[PDB]
Structure 1
Amino acid sequence: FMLTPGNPKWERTNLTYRIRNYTPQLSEAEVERAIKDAFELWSVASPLIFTRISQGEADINIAFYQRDHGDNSPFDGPNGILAHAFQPGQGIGGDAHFDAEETWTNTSANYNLFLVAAHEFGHSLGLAHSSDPGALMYPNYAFRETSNYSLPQDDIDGIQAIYG
C-alpha cells in the first residue's frame, strides 16, 4: 500500500458526504445504495463513520462531471479515466468526481459504480495507489463479485496505517 505524499488525513472520524447530482444511467436510489456500500467497506476496516447530508457543506462532495470542469484534471469521454478524488483537506479536499460520459452500472457490465466509488474514497481518506494487483487501490478497474465483497488485506493495512 502507499500513503499519499505528505500523509494528509482527516482529524475528525465522523465525516459527512453529499451527492450533488446523479447519472441518468441508474435510479437515484441505486446511486445512493452504491455510494453507501462503498463508504461502509472503509468503515468496517477503520474507526471512520460516514453520514449523508441533504443540504449544507459536506466534507466529501460527490459529483458527476464531463471533460473540462475547472479543477485542472479534465475527463476524457467514454472509457479512459473513469473518476478521480482529492486528498483530505478543506473545500475541494476529499471530494470525488465521476466521468458523466461513462455507462455506470450496478452489475458485472462496465463500469460498476460501487467498485469505482470504493476506490475513489480510498483517495478521499489519504491513500495512494498500490502495486498489489489484488488491491482495491490498484490503479486499473477490474470487476469483482460485489455481493459479499470486503476490503483486501493490502487496503486494510493501508487505512489502519493512517487511522488505526
Structure 2
Amino acid sequence: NPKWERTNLTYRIRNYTPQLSEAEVERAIKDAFELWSVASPLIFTRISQGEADINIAFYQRDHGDNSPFDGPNGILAHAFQPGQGIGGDAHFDAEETWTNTSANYNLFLVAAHEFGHSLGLAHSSDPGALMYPNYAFRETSNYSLPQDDIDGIQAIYG
C-alpha cells in the first residue's frame, strides 16, 4: 500500500485549460485538496515553479507517460499513486469541456477524485463514494467528503 511518509506536500499547476479563468482553475484545485485535508493529517502547499510532490497538468492524447488520453468524453483524467517523480502526479484531459457548473465535466469533482489516487486510495464500489469509478455531478457549494472516502484516507494515514 503506497503512502506518503510526509504530511506537508507541495503541488504545482504546470498549465491551465482556456475553458476557465486561471483563478477558477486554481480554486477548483485548492478546494479539492481541502476536502482530503479536513479528514487527514495532510497539509498541501502550492508552489509556482520548482519540483513539487504533485504536478497538475492538462494534456492531450499522447503525453509521454504511456497512458494517452482519448479525446472528448471517455477517460477524463488520471493520477499516479504516492511515490517519487511521476508518483502522485495528476493529468487532466485537455480535450474535455471543463466547467465550474453542473454541466459535464466539473473540474473540482474530477480533481477531488484524482487527488484521492494521488494520496493512495483505490476505487470504491460504493456508488455514493467520490472514489467510485464513474463520474456523477453532486452539489459542490459546501461539498463535503462522503463517509466511505473518509474511512478510506483514515485507514491509510489518520
Gaps spanning 5+ residues in structure 1: where?
1-6
Encode CA deviations 1:95-124: one digit per residue, 9 max, x unaligned. 000000001001000000000000000000
What are the residue-to-residue correspondences of 1:89-128 with 2, within 5 Å? 89-128=83-122
SS of match in other structure, 1:15: strand
Encode CA deviations 1:39-66: one digit per residue, 9 max, x unaligned. 0000010000000001110000000001
Shift of 1:72: 1.0
Tell me the distance in 1 between the aligned counterparts of 2:24 and 2:44: 18
Identity %: 100
TM-score, length of structure 2 as denominator length: 0.99
Tell me the distance in 2 between the aligned counterparts of 1:87 and 1:126: 5
Shift of 1:81: 0.5
Shift of 1:148: 1.2
TM-score, length of structure 1 as denominator length: 0.96
Shift of 1:78: 0.2
Q: Which has the higher contact order (CA 8 A, sep 6+)?
A: 1
The runs of at least 4 aligned residues of structure 1 exceeding 2 Å deviation read none
SS of match in other structure, 1:106: coil
SS of match in other structure, 1:64: strand
Encode CA deviations 1:126-145: one digit per residue, 9 max, x unaligned. 00000000000000000000
Shift of 1:13: 0.2
Tell me the distance in 2 between the aligned counterparts of 1:33 and 1:55: 18
Structure 1 vs Structure 2 CA RMSD: 0.4
Tell me the distance in 2 between the aligned counterparts of 1:92 and 1:32: 21
Tell me the distance in 2 between the aligned counterparts of 1:72 and 1:150: 33
Aligned counterpart, 1:151: 145
Tell me the distance in 2 between the aligned counterparts of 1:8 and 1:158: 13
Aligned counterpart, 1:67: 61
Shift of 1:70: 1.3
Tell me the distance in 2 between the aligned counterparts of 1:82 and 1:56: 26
